[PDB]
Amino acid sequence: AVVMTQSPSTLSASVGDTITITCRASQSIETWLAWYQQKPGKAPKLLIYKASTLKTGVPSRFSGSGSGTEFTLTISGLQFDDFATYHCQHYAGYSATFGQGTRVEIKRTVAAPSVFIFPPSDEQLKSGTASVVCLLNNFYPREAKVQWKVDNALQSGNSQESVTEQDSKDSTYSLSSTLTLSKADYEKHKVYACEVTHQGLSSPVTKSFNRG
Amino acid sequence: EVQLVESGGGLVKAGGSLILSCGVSNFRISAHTMNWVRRVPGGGLEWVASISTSSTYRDYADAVKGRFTVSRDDLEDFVYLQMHKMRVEDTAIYYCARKGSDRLSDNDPFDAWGPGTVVTVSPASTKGPSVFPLAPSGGTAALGCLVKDYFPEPVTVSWNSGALTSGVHTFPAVLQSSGLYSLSSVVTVPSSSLGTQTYICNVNHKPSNTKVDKKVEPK
Ligand SMILES: C[C@H](O)[C@H]1O[C@H](O[C@@H]2[C@@H](O[C@@H]3[C@@H](O[C@@H]4[C@H](O)[C@@H](O)O[C@H](CO)[C@H]4O)O[C@H](CO)[C@@H](O)[C@@H]3O)O[C@H](CO)[C@@H](O)[C@@H]2O)[C@@H](O)[C@@H](O)[C@@H]1O
């Protein structure tokens, strides 16, 4: 019944900065806490255990502290390699509970996306399928909402989206959502719209097209 | 009364992997030599694997040897079958059985069987990515390449053989409800440079040995 609460869920920081990630236990867990680094796709890598014991090979810039309920991960002088997710973990004999995770990313200013809608290619249409694509280009922060509105009717369970990593130079994100319909379904409707909701937008942007 | 239940069957590509589990009722696995048998479409039965009492000895059919692994969980009464580097000929109904009698002997028949789980090995190991253009329309615009119904992880894309790098965004692949992947690759270019400049994506699918190039033009 031990509940682990990490804070913040997302930490925006610049290179060279000294940042702290807070982890909270619902009840006393003494020092049975472990910090892990996890980069997209790759498996979690153990950094600290016994709340402060730094594993062999882990840089000196990493720091562990705390006991009972309050725990702290400290990265002094941020390196590009340090930019990833951090998971705090209460490790018991035959059980464990993790934190929600902390995504440590590069801070930059709020940037509204450039939205582009792509109708399905005639080539694909002939093959019995229709893939309608929406692009959200170079936006900040990562949190963005996409809604598909076929003839004003909102869609659900036909769309699939994927997001790129933070840009090397500009520090923004890109999202691409693909609405997938049969040739038959696609030809029953006229107006295909993509409504985008984001922090850098005064109101949601709706990019649209008609069949021909 | 004695029952056995196999779980984990389904469809797999050639070269793939799939694990089958066997669960039981009204007896403990502990003292029984557990076995797996398959019914090939041809009609006959092929003895697959055998696991001796407390995993002492493990025997396999010649074809399945070095690809399959038999395992036992005596404490929770479970039998496992690991199937790797899977061949089309491995397509069969898989039954888990026990060597048994009223008094256990040194050589008993398969007195109890499970109902059977269906395992189907598809001929095609890799799929061909179908490439589609994401055709354009304030001084700047975007175009792209939709890499579809293909497989399997991973596909690489480059634009103008590698010449165009600035503005390029190649998105994480998305697993579609079919079992096939789909990804998009886009690039932002000025609206002016449309008619003049030529744009081509370079799709590289190393598993299937596929290399596709498609030009993105408006209308
Ligand atoms: C052997 C079939 O696979 C068999 O297995 C299950 O029953 C077990 C089996 O165990 C065998 C037995 O040892 C032999 C034998 O009794 C005798 O000739 O003496 C020797 C040792 O003193 C030995 O070679 O027990 C050993 C270890 O316990 C195992 O190596 C061997 O698997 O036989 C007895 C009954 O004879 C059972 O108590 C065992 O549980 C059942 O699946 C059975 O039905 C199968 O026919």
Tab-separated table of C-alpha atoms and ligand atoms in Angstrom:
chain	number	residue	atom	x	y	z
A	1	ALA	CA	0.000	0.000	0.000
A	2	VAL	CA	3.079	2.336	-0.469
A	3	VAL	CA	2.239	5.230	-2.884
A	4	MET	CA	5.137	6.963	-4.724
A	5	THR	CA	4.670	10.545	-5.963
A	6	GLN	CA	7.314	12.210	-8.182
A	7	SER	CA	7.500	16.020	-8.705
A	8	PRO	CA	7.582	17.632	-11.237
A	9	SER	CA	6.127	15.346	-13.972
A	10	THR	CA	8.067	17.498	-16.519
A	11	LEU	CA	11.195	19.546	-15.689
A	12	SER	CA	12.219	22.241	-18.233
A	13	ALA	CA	15.848	23.198	-17.756
A	14	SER	CA	18.889	24.439	-19.674
A	15	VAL	CA	22.360	22.873	-20.019
A	16	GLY	CA	24.758	23.542	-17.117
A	17	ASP	CA	21.808	23.952	-14.678
A	18	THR	CA	21.554	22.319	-11.260
A	19	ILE	CA	18.111	20.673	-10.981
A	20	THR	CA	16.265	18.667	-8.308
A	21	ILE	CA	13.572	15.972	-8.757
A	22	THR	CA	11.401	15.313	-5.675
A	23	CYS	CA	10.054	11.859	-4.817
A	24	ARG	CA	7.481	11.309	-2.012
A	25	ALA	CA	6.506	8.093	-0.194
A	26	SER	CA	2.948	7.708	1.302
A	27	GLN	CA	4.494	6.088	4.450
A	28	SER	CA	8.121	5.648	5.763
A	29	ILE	CA	10.278	3.588	3.368
A	30	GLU	CA	13.528	4.331	5.319
A	31	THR	CA	16.109	4.527	2.479
A	32	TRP	CA	14.780	1.669	0.291
A	33	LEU	CA	14.627	3.984	-2.739
A	34	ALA	CA	16.254	3.671	-6.205
A	35	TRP	CA	16.562	6.269	-8.996
A	36	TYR	CA	16.596	5.159	-12.661
A	37	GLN	CA	17.391	6.891	-15.951
A	38	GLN	CA	15.268	5.898	-18.981
A	39	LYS	CA	15.759	7.122	-22.549
A	40	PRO	CA	13.028	6.490	-25.227
A	41	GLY	CA	13.027	2.872	-26.453
A	42	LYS	CA	16.044	1.899	-24.296
A	43	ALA	CA	15.718	-0.099	-21.016
A	44	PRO	CA	15.869	1.698	-17.571
A	45	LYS	CA	19.414	2.181	-16.185
A	46	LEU	CA	19.885	2.149	-12.383
A	47	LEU	CA	21.644	5.333	-11.131
A	48	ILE	CA	21.164	5.437	-7.322
A	49	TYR	CA	19.980	2.916	-4.704
A	50	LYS	CA	19.804	2.982	-0.835
A	51	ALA	CA	18.602	6.604	-1.448
A	52	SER	CA	22.196	7.934	-1.930
A	53	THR	CA	24.405	4.951	-3.003
A	54	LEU	CA	25.490	5.831	-6.548
A	55	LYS	CA	26.018	2.765	-8.811
A	56	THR	CA	29.505	2.162	-10.365
A	57	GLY	CA	29.920	4.152	-13.611
A	58	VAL	CA	27.235	6.761	-12.856
A	59	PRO	CA	28.670	10.351	-13.200
A	60	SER	CA	29.548	12.423	-10.085
A	61	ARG	CA	27.005	15.087	-11.269
A	62	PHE	CA	24.194	12.763	-10.046
A	63	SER	CA	23.191	12.952	-6.362
A	64	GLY	CA	20.867	11.040	-4.043
A	65	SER	CA	19.451	12.215	-0.689
A	66	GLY	CA	16.491	11.776	1.668
A	67	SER	CA	14.968	9.251	4.137
A	68	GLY	CA	11.551	7.948	5.264
A	69	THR	CA	9.130	9.941	3.050
A	70	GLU	CA	11.040	12.752	1.239
A	71	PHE	CA	13.623	11.855	-1.400
A	72	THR	CA	15.683	13.948	-3.837
A	73	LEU	CA	17.546	13.352	-7.112
A	74	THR	CA	19.993	16.144	-7.937
A	75	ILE	CA	21.750	16.696	-11.256
A	76	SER	CA	24.416	19.404	-10.879
A	77	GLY	CA	25.486	20.848	-14.237
A	78	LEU	CA	23.184	19.401	-16.935
A	79	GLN	CA	24.733	17.534	-19.846
A	80	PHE	CA	22.852	16.774	-23.138
A	81	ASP	CA	23.064	13.082	-22.299
A	82	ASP	CA	21.169	13.703	-18.979
A	83	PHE	CA	18.001	14.710	-20.903
A	84	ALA	CA	15.607	11.729	-20.328
A	85	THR	CA	12.954	10.367	-17.910
A	86	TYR	CA	13.663	9.724	-14.204
A	87	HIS	CA	11.748	7.079	-12.206
A	88	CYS	CA	11.883	6.860	-8.423
A	89	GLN	CA	11.318	3.403	-6.951
A	90	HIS	CA	10.513	1.944	-3.538
A	91	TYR	CA	12.168	-1.497	-3.581
A	92	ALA	CA	10.842	-3.968	-0.984
A	93	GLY	CA	11.922	-7.642	-0.616
A	94	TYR	CA	9.266	-9.177	-2.899
A	95	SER	CA	7.478	-6.047	-4.236
A	96	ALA	CA	8.174	-2.547	-5.684
A	97	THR	CA	6.318	0.678	-6.577
A	98	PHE	CA	7.524	3.319	-9.041
A	99	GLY	CA	7.007	7.064	-9.384
A	100	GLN	CA	4.991	8.464	-12.302
A	101	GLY	CA	8.237	9.567	-13.965
A	102	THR	CA	9.914	12.914	-14.583
A	103	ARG	CA	10.650	14.016	-18.101
A	104	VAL	CA	13.724	16.288	-17.954
A	105	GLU	CA	13.781	18.332	-21.192
A	106	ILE	CA	15.325	21.524	-22.582
A	107	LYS	CA	13.574	24.764	-21.643
A	108	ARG	CA	12.606	27.146	-24.474
A	109	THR	CA	9.712	29.550	-25.120
A	110	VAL	CA	6.103	28.576	-25.899
A	111	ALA	CA	5.863	28.002	-29.681
A	112	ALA	CA	2.543	27.454	-31.446
A	113	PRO	CA	2.488	24.614	-34.067
A	114	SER	CA	2.225	25.007	-37.824
A	115	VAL	CA	-0.708	22.707	-38.744
A	116	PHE	CA	-0.853	20.938	-42.155
A	117	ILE	CA	-3.514	18.539	-43.421
A	118	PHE	CA	-2.813	15.923	-46.142
A	119	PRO	CA	-5.567	14.250	-48.159
A	120	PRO	CA	-4.994	10.556	-49.063
A	121	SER	CA	-2.970	9.999	-52.289
A	122	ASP	CA	-5.057	8.751	-55.315
A	123	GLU	CA	-2.576	5.818	-55.525
A	124	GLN	CA	-3.641	4.640	-52.000
A	125	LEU	CA	-7.313	5.351	-52.759
A	126	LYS	CA	-7.179	2.855	-55.688
A	127	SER	CA	-5.800	0.202	-53.237
A	128	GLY	CA	-9.028	0.401	-51.120
A	129	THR	CA	-7.639	2.538	-48.223
A	130	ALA	CA	-7.618	6.246	-47.232
A	131	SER	CA	-4.976	7.710	-44.903
A	132	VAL	CA	-5.693	11.331	-43.850
A	133	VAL	CA	-2.625	12.902	-42.147
A	134	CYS	CA	-2.371	15.925	-39.825
A	135	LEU	CA	0.890	17.581	-39.043
A	136	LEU	CA	1.692	19.751	-35.991
A	137	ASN	CA	5.038	21.292	-36.834
A	138	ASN	CA	7.697	22.648	-34.440
A	139	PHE	CA	5.645	23.327	-31.244
A	140	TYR	CA	6.445	23.859	-27.532
A	141	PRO	CA	5.685	22.383	-24.990
A	142	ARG	CA	5.012	18.692	-25.865
A	143	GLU	CA	1.373	18.709	-24.632
A	144	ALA	CA	-0.927	18.986	-27.714
A	145	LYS	CA	-4.498	17.801	-28.550
A	146	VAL	CA	-5.647	16.656	-32.033
A	147	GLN	CA	-9.287	15.986	-32.975
A	148	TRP	CA	-10.606	14.569	-36.282
A	149	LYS	CA	-13.957	16.049	-37.480
A	150	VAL	CA	-15.368	14.283	-40.577
A	151	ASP	CA	-18.371	16.419	-41.841
A	152	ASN	CA	-18.221	18.015	-38.318
A	153	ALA	CA	-18.596	14.536	-36.687
A	154	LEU	CA	-15.809	13.969	-34.147
A	155	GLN	CA	-13.855	10.721	-34.676
A	156	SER	CA	-12.468	8.156	-32.168
A	157	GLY	CA	-10.605	4.851	-32.606
A	158	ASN	CA	-9.543	5.479	-36.268
A	159	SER	CA	-6.703	7.921	-35.505
A	160	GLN	CA	-3.113	7.144	-34.436
A	161	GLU	CA	-0.436	9.710	-33.557
A	162	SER	CA	3.353	9.733	-32.916
A	163	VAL	CA	5.663	12.487	-31.526
A	164	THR	CA	9.305	13.248	-32.371
A	165	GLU	CA	12.016	13.863	-29.742
A	166	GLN	CA	12.936	17.437	-28.730
A	167	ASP	CA	14.743	19.101	-31.699
A	168	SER	CA	18.587	19.185	-31.631
A	169	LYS	CA	18.748	22.962	-32.438
A	170	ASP	CA	15.257	24.577	-32.047
A	171	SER	CA	14.161	22.505	-28.964
A	172	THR	CA	10.560	21.964	-30.258
A	173	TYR	CA	8.366	18.877	-30.867
A	174	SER	CA	6.460	17.535	-33.866
A	175	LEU	CA	3.317	15.377	-33.851
A	176	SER	CA	1.738	13.473	-36.744
A	177	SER	CA	-1.786	12.002	-36.448
A	178	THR	CA	-3.137	9.590	-39.119
A	179	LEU	CA	-6.874	9.049	-39.617
A	180	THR	CA	-7.386	5.681	-41.386
A	181	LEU	CA	-10.578	4.927	-43.348
A	182	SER	CA	-11.633	2.379	-45.952
A	183	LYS	CA	-12.014	3.764	-49.550
A	184	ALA	CA	-15.783	3.122	-49.092
A	185	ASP	CA	-16.064	5.088	-45.747
A	186	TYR	CA	-13.924	7.964	-47.121
A	187	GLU	CA	-16.182	8.405	-50.179
A	188	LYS	CA	-19.339	8.747	-47.972
A	189	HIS	CA	-18.093	12.143	-46.622
A	190	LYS	CA	-17.101	15.557	-48.008
A	191	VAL	CA	-15.261	17.615	-45.391
A	192	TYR	CA	-12.244	16.284	-43.516
A	193	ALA	CA	-10.983	18.537	-40.730
A	194	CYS	CA	-8.257	18.406	-38.117
A	195	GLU	CA	-8.753	20.595	-34.949
A	196	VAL	CA	-5.555	21.296	-32.983
A	197	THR	CA	-5.527	22.414	-29.316
A	198	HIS	CA	-2.251	23.795	-27.834
A	199	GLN	CA	-0.916	26.177	-25.103
A	200	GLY	CA	0.541	28.666	-27.678
A	201	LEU	CA	-2.829	28.944	-29.457
A	202	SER	CA	-5.430	31.578	-28.409
A	203	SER	CA	-8.134	29.211	-29.698
A	204	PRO	CA	-7.864	25.800	-31.455
A	205	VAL	CA	-6.724	25.893	-35.129
A	206	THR	CA	-8.861	23.866	-37.573
A	207	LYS	CA	-7.132	22.846	-40.838
A	208	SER	CA	-9.531	21.450	-43.430
A	209	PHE	CA	-10.090	20.106	-47.013
A	210	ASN	CA	-12.911	18.843	-49.254
A	211	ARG	CA	-12.747	15.782	-51.550
A	212	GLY	CA	-11.605	17.598	-54.785
B	1	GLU	CA	-12.285	-35.710	-14.201
B	2	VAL	CA	-8.546	-34.861	-14.715
B	3	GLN	CA	-8.234	-31.773	-16.990
B	4	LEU	CA	-5.395	-29.930	-18.878
B	5	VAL	CA	-5.651	-26.484	-20.608
B	6	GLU	CA	-3.173	-25.097	-23.159
B	7	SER	CA	-3.047	-21.290	-23.681
B	8	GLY	CA	-1.086	-18.898	-25.883
B	9	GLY	CA	-1.810	-19.971	-29.465
B	10	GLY	CA	-2.222	-17.733	-32.505
B	11	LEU	CA	-0.659	-16.332	-35.664
B	12	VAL	CA	3.123	-15.740	-36.015
B	13	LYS	CA	5.429	-14.787	-38.899
B	14	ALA	CA	8.157	-17.212	-40.049
B	15	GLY	CA	11.295	-16.745	-37.905
B	16	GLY	CA	9.217	-15.466	-34.978
B	17	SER	CA	8.620	-16.684	-31.426
B	18	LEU	CA	5.579	-17.753	-29.343
B	19	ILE	CA	5.266	-19.255	-25.846
B	20	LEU	CA	2.566	-21.795	-24.929
B	21	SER	CA	1.489	-22.466	-21.350
B	22	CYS	CA	-0.270	-25.538	-20.020
B	23	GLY	CA	-2.426	-25.373	-16.871
B	24	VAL	CA	-4.149	-28.300	-15.060
B	25	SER	CA	-7.040	-29.395	-12.779
B	26	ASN	CA	-7.686	-32.262	-10.329
B	27	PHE	CA	-4.014	-33.419	-10.128
B	28	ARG	CA	-0.526	-32.081	-9.444
B	29	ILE	CA	2.123	-31.867	-12.212
B	30	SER	CA	4.976	-32.761	-9.747
B	31	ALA	CA	5.184	-36.562	-10.280
B	32	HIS	CA	4.141	-36.642	-13.984
B	33	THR	CA	6.370	-36.593	-17.040
B	34	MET	CA	4.827	-33.704	-19.003
B	35	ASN	CA	4.705	-33.768	-22.829
B	36	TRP	CA	3.713	-31.608	-25.816
B	37	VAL	CA	2.251	-33.120	-29.043
B	38	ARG	CA	1.011	-31.358	-32.183
B	39	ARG	CA	-1.566	-32.278	-34.851
B	40	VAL	CA	-0.201	-31.213	-38.225
B	41	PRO	CA	-2.844	-30.333	-40.958
B	42	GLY	CA	-1.892	-33.581	-42.778
B	43	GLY	CA	-3.731	-35.370	-39.948
B	44	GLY	CA	-1.043	-37.107	-37.910
B	45	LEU	CA	0.495	-36.399	-34.509
B	46	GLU	CA	4.098	-35.418	-33.906
B	47	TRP	CA	5.528	-35.849	-30.406
B	48	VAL	CA	7.117	-32.486	-29.644
B	49	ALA	CA	8.812	-32.273	-26.263
B	50	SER	CA	9.031	-34.193	-22.996
B	51	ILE	CA	9.970	-32.909	-19.513
B	52	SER	CA	10.908	-35.449	-16.845
B	53	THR	CA	9.843	-35.309	-13.208
B	54	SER	CA	11.315	-32.149	-11.577
B	55	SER	CA	13.021	-31.102	-14.966
B	56	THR	CA	15.691	-33.863	-14.709
B	57	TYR	CA	15.576	-34.832	-18.419
B	58	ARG	CA	14.294	-32.730	-21.424
B	59	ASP	CA	13.749	-34.449	-24.821
B	60	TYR	CA	12.772	-32.824	-28.110
B	61	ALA	CA	11.629	-33.900	-31.617
B	62	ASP	CA	14.536	-33.614	-34.068
B	63	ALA	CA	12.934	-30.777	-36.105
B	64	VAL	CA	12.027	-28.723	-32.998
B	65	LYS	CA	15.430	-29.391	-31.295
B	66	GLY	CA	17.452	-26.257	-30.539
B	67	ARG	CA	14.436	-23.970	-31.244
B	68	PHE	CA	11.931	-25.121	-28.612
B	69	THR	CA	12.209	-25.199	-24.795
B	70	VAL	CA	10.085	-27.263	-22.400
B	71	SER	CA	9.706	-26.008	-18.785
B	72	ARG	CA	7.874	-26.931	-15.627
B	73	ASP	CA	6.388	-25.046	-12.640
B	74	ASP	CA	5.743	-27.735	-10.047
B	75	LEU	CA	4.555	-25.316	-7.292
B	76	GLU	CA	1.784	-23.658	-9.380
B	77	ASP	CA	1.273	-26.684	-11.755
B	78	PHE	CA	2.342	-25.183	-15.146
B	79	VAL	CA	4.092	-26.497	-18.250
B	80	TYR	CA	5.697	-24.194	-20.807
B	81	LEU	CA	6.770	-24.483	-24.456
B	82	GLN	CA	9.066	-21.796	-25.948
B	83	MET	CA	8.952	-21.778	-29.738
B	84	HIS	CA	11.643	-19.773	-31.562
B	85	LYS	CA	12.989	-19.380	-35.126
B	86	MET	CA	9.505	-20.660	-36.033
B	87	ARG	CA	9.029	-22.599	-39.305
B	88	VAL	CA	5.830	-22.904	-41.479
B	89	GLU	CA	5.918	-26.726	-40.781
B	90	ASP	CA	5.430	-25.852	-37.043
B	91	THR	CA	1.748	-24.977	-37.953
B	92	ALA	CA	-0.373	-27.377	-35.836
B	93	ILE	CA	-2.842	-27.750	-32.928
B	94	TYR	CA	-0.695	-28.116	-29.772
B	95	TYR	CA	-1.785	-30.496	-27.017
B	96	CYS	CA	-0.126	-30.851	-23.624
B	97	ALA	CA	-0.322	-34.428	-22.274
B	98	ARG	CA	0.810	-36.550	-19.268
B	99	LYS	CA	2.370	-40.035	-18.994
B	100	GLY	CA	0.005	-41.637	-16.509
B	101	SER	CA	-1.822	-44.654	-14.988
B	102	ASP	CA	-3.694	-45.758	-11.789
B	103	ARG	CA	-0.203	-46.620	-10.351
B	104	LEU	CA	2.577	-44.528	-11.964
B	105	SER	CA	5.155	-46.755	-13.693
B	106	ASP	CA	8.525	-46.193	-15.462
B	107	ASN	CA	6.682	-46.050	-18.874
B	108	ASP	CA	2.994	-45.034	-19.044
B	109	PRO	CA	0.847	-43.843	-22.002
B	110	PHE	CA	-0.577	-40.303	-22.455
B	111	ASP	CA	-3.720	-41.004	-20.351
B	112	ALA	CA	-4.710	-37.266	-20.171
B	113	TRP	CA	-4.688	-34.473	-22.883
B	114	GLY	CA	-5.614	-30.796	-23.136
B	115	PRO	CA	-8.231	-29.572	-25.701
B	116	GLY	CA	-5.483	-28.006	-27.879
B	117	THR	CA	-4.273	-24.498	-28.882
B	118	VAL	CA	-3.910	-23.452	-32.539
B	119	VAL	CA	-0.488	-22.196	-33.708
B	120	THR	CA	-0.255	-20.879	-37.278
B	121	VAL	CA	3.096	-19.919	-38.871
B	122	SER	CA	2.679	-17.442	-41.788
B	123	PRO	CA	5.037	-17.968	-44.798
B	124	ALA	CA	6.075	-14.297	-45.209
B	125	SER	CA	8.733	-13.209	-42.645
B	126	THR	CA	8.911	-9.574	-43.850
B	127	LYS	CA	6.397	-7.220	-45.483
B	128	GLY	CA	6.727	-4.654	-48.228
B	129	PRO	CA	6.273	-1.005	-47.250
B	130	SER	CA	3.883	0.844	-49.564
B	131	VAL	CA	5.132	4.477	-50.025
B	132	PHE	CA	2.669	7.387	-50.552
B	133	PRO	CA	3.093	11.127	-51.136
B	134	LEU	CA	1.967	13.759	-48.670
B	135	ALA	CA	1.369	16.473	-51.321
B	136	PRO	CA	1.346	20.241	-50.472
B	137	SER	CA	-1.230	23.136	-50.980
B	138	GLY	CA	2.407	31.588	-45.841
B	139	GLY	CA	5.659	31.609	-47.849
B	140	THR	CA	6.463	28.156	-46.374
B	141	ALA	CA	4.704	24.751	-46.670
B	142	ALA	CA	5.169	21.065	-45.928
B	143	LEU	CA	5.311	17.799	-47.864
B	144	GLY	CA	6.042	14.222	-46.851
B	145	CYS	CA	6.105	10.486	-47.469
B	146	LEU	CA	3.705	8.089	-45.881
B	147	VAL	CA	5.487	4.725	-45.405
B	148	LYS	CA	2.712	2.206	-44.864
B	149	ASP	CA	1.603	-1.428	-44.336
B	150	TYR	CA	5.043	-2.845	-43.818
B	151	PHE	CA	7.367	-4.439	-41.414
B	152	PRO	CA	9.163	-4.968	-39.380
B	153	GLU	CA	11.005	-2.334	-37.459
B	154	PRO	CA	13.002	-0.563	-38.671
B	155	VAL	CA	12.747	1.745	-41.626
B	156	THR	CA	15.128	4.573	-42.433
B	157	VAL	CA	14.205	7.602	-44.572
B	158	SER	CA	16.349	10.372	-46.097
B	159	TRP	CA	15.436	13.191	-48.496
B	160	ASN	CA	17.120	13.917	-51.891
B	161	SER	CA	19.512	10.917	-51.255
B	162	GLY	CA	20.682	12.742	-48.072
B	163	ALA	CA	21.054	16.289	-49.506
B	164	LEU	CA	17.962	17.723	-47.762
B	165	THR	CA	18.413	17.396	-43.939
B	166	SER	CA	17.256	20.769	-42.556
B	167	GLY	CA	13.512	20.845	-41.718
B	168	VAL	CA	13.160	17.023	-42.002
B	169	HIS	CA	11.057	15.177	-39.374
B	170	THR	CA	10.866	11.325	-39.438
B	171	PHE	CA	8.209	10.192	-36.937
B	172	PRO	CA	8.222	7.102	-34.674
B	173	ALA	CA	6.648	4.078	-36.428
B	174	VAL	CA	3.092	3.237	-35.382
B	175	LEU	CA	1.860	-0.303	-34.952
B	176	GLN	CA	-1.513	-0.546	-36.752
B	177	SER	CA	-4.335	-2.940	-35.564
B	178	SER	CA	-3.256	-5.253	-38.492
B	179	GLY	CA	0.179	-6.105	-37.057
B	180	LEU	CA	1.852	-3.882	-39.680
B	181	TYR	CA	3.748	-0.606	-39.030
B	182	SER	CA	3.266	2.826	-40.596
B	183	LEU	CA	5.385	5.988	-40.374
B	184	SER	CA	5.509	9.413	-41.849
B	185	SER	CA	8.461	11.540	-42.858
B	186	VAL	CA	7.953	15.243	-43.576
B	187	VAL	CA	9.982	18.349	-44.467
B	188	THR	CA	9.128	22.088	-44.382
B	189	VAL	CA	10.170	23.987	-47.528
B	190	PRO	CA	9.372	27.546	-48.781
B	191	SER	CA	6.192	27.811	-50.959
B	192	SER	CA	8.236	29.638	-53.684
B	193	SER	CA	10.804	26.813	-54.202
B	194	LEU	CA	7.893	24.366	-54.997
B	195	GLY	CA	7.581	24.378	-58.825
B	196	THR	CA	11.357	24.743	-59.376
B	197	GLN	CA	13.013	22.351	-56.809
B	198	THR	CA	12.541	18.548	-56.895
B	199	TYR	CA	11.848	16.533	-53.677
B	200	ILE	CA	12.273	12.720	-53.245
B	201	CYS	CA	12.196	10.558	-50.054
B	202	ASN	CA	14.594	7.601	-49.717
B	203	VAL	CA	12.863	4.683	-47.940
B	204	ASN	CA	15.287	1.980	-46.706
B	205	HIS	CA	13.770	-1.233	-45.253
B	206	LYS	CA	16.800	-3.373	-44.350
B	207	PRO	CA	14.893	-6.626	-43.336
B	208	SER	CA	12.911	-6.930	-46.652
B	209	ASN	CA	16.015	-5.439	-48.479
B	210	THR	CA	13.545	-2.788	-49.858
B	211	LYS	CA	14.785	0.587	-51.207
B	212	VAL	CA	12.017	2.917	-52.523
B	213	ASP	CA	12.250	6.493	-53.903
B	214	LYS	CA	9.191	8.678	-54.487
B	215	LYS	CA	8.796	12.208	-55.812
B	216	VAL	CA	6.393	14.531	-54.025
B	217	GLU	CA	4.707	16.990	-56.438
B	218	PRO	CA	1.484	19.096	-55.949
B	219	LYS	CA	-1.687	17.623	-57.665
C	1	LIG	C1	9.541	-42.417	-16.343
C	1	LIG	C2	8.330	-41.970	-17.108
C	1	LIG	O1	8.743	-40.761	-17.699
C	1	LIG	C3	7.278	-41.763	-16.007
C	1	LIG	O2	7.454	-40.561	-15.157
C	1	LIG	C4	6.472	-40.336	-14.019
C	1	LIG	O3	6.610	-41.128	-12.781
C	1	LIG	C5	7.928	-40.913	-12.252
C	1	LIG	C6	8.923	-41.989	-12.617
C	1	LIG	O4	10.247	-41.576	-12.257
C	1	LIG	C7	11.388	-42.367	-12.748
C	1	LIG	C8	11.952	-43.104	-11.487
C	1	LIG	O5	13.224	-43.827	-11.373
C	1	LIG	C9	13.553	-45.071	-12.006
C	1	LIG	C10	12.756	-46.303	-11.489
C	1	LIG	O6	11.845	-45.989	-10.425
C	1	LIG	C11	13.593	-47.548	-11.074
C	1	LIG	O7	13.913	-48.484	-12.175
C	1	LIG	O8	14.663	-47.171	-10.169
C	1	LIG	C12	15.555	-46.080	-10.553
C	1	LIG	C13	15.975	-45.304	-9.299
C	1	LIG	O9	15.875	-46.065	-8.053
C	1	LIG	C14	15.075	-45.075	-11.665
C	1	LIG	O10	15.868	-45.199	-12.866
C	1	LIG	O11	12.203	-42.053	-10.529
C	1	LIG	C15	13.317	-41.198	-10.930
C	1	LIG	C16	13.638	-40.205	-9.832
C	1	LIG	O12	12.544	-40.183	-8.903
C	1	LIG	C17	13.184	-40.506	-12.292
C	1	LIG	O13	14.517	-40.436	-12.780
C	1	LIG	C18	12.394	-41.323	-13.338
C	1	LIG	O14	11.712	-40.325	-14.093
C	1	LIG	O15	8.564	-43.268	-12.143
C	1	LIG	C19	7.939	-43.433	-10.854
C	1	LIG	C20	7.207	-44.804	-10.913
C	1	LIG	O16	8.053	-45.866	-11.458
C	1	LIG	C21	7.077	-42.264	-10.290
C	1	LIG	O17	7.017	-42.225	-8.804
C	1	LIG	C22	7.684	-40.943	-10.784
C	1	LIG	O18	6.937	-39.783	-10.409
C	1	LIG	C23	5.104	-40.547	-14.625
C	1	LIG	O19	4.937	-39.562	-15.651
C	1	LIG	C24	5.018	-41.962	-15.183
C	1	LIG	O20	3.698	-42.265	-15.473
C	1	LIG	C25	5.846	-42.053	-16.444
C	1	LIG	O21	5.773	-43.350	-17.025
